[PDB]
Design a protein around this ligand. Structure first.
Ligand SMILES: C/C(=C\C(=O)N[C@@H](Cc1ccccc1)[C@H](O)CN(Cc1cccs1)S(=O)(=O)c1cc(F)c(F)cc1F)C(F)(F)F
Lengths: 99, 99
């Protein structure tokens, strides 16, 4: 697919039994999802952007389906205002910038 | 160009005759540059990111050449962690996401 940027590049993602709308975000190194109580081990982390830092929980090797494409990797879970698909998973679904 | 996402999509920009490195950021609605001097009238604005809200200075109709492509639009100056080119200018240079 090709996604123009007139509007936010929101797409439907699936993580287990939850479907969410998430930004395809080339400006994010890592994937950050809204608060959710995922199973398994995790580690605490601080992540920073505009406005400062929030505390997240890092879960590894989490399968996520993005627009019907399979990905699996690290997801950061915390009080983000928007779900964010970062470069760690964008590469896995074959995503590039073109102009 | 086609830009893959295994590395940060940093490009050279030219603004007011100065060369800077900026991140192509599809998750950003706006273009935000670190503290710098720009000529002309500006107005105070507030924007919200992952960590909360910040105050920025809004400059309108500023030319930036982004990786050899011309844009003229709104540039916000303030405490961003990194210079980011947002959708307001990404659309001007014909940037799309593809996978
Ligand atoms: C405020 C703006 C952009 C912005 O913050 N963009 C981030 C995505 C976002 C949008 C709206 C609300 C919250 C977050 C960036 O595209 C991604 N950021 C990175 C930024 C780069 C430049 C500024 S913020 S990040 O802070 O969210 C971020 C930080 C991490 F440490 C991380 F691991 C993952 C992330 F997504 C705007 F450009 F002014 F609109």
């Amino acid at each position: 697919p090709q996604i123009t940027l007139w509007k936010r590049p929101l797409v439907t993602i699936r993580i287990g039994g939850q479907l969410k709308e998430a930004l395809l975000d080339t400006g994010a190194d890592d994937t950050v999802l809204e608060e959710m109580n995922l199973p398994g081990k995790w580690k605490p982390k601080m992540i920073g952007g505009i406005g400062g830092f929030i505390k997240v929980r890092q879960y590894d090797q989490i399968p996520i389906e993005i627009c019907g494409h399979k990905a699996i990797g690290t997801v950061l879970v915390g009080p983000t205002p928007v779900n964010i698909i970062g470069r760690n998973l964008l590469t896995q679904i074959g995503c590039t910038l073109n102009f």
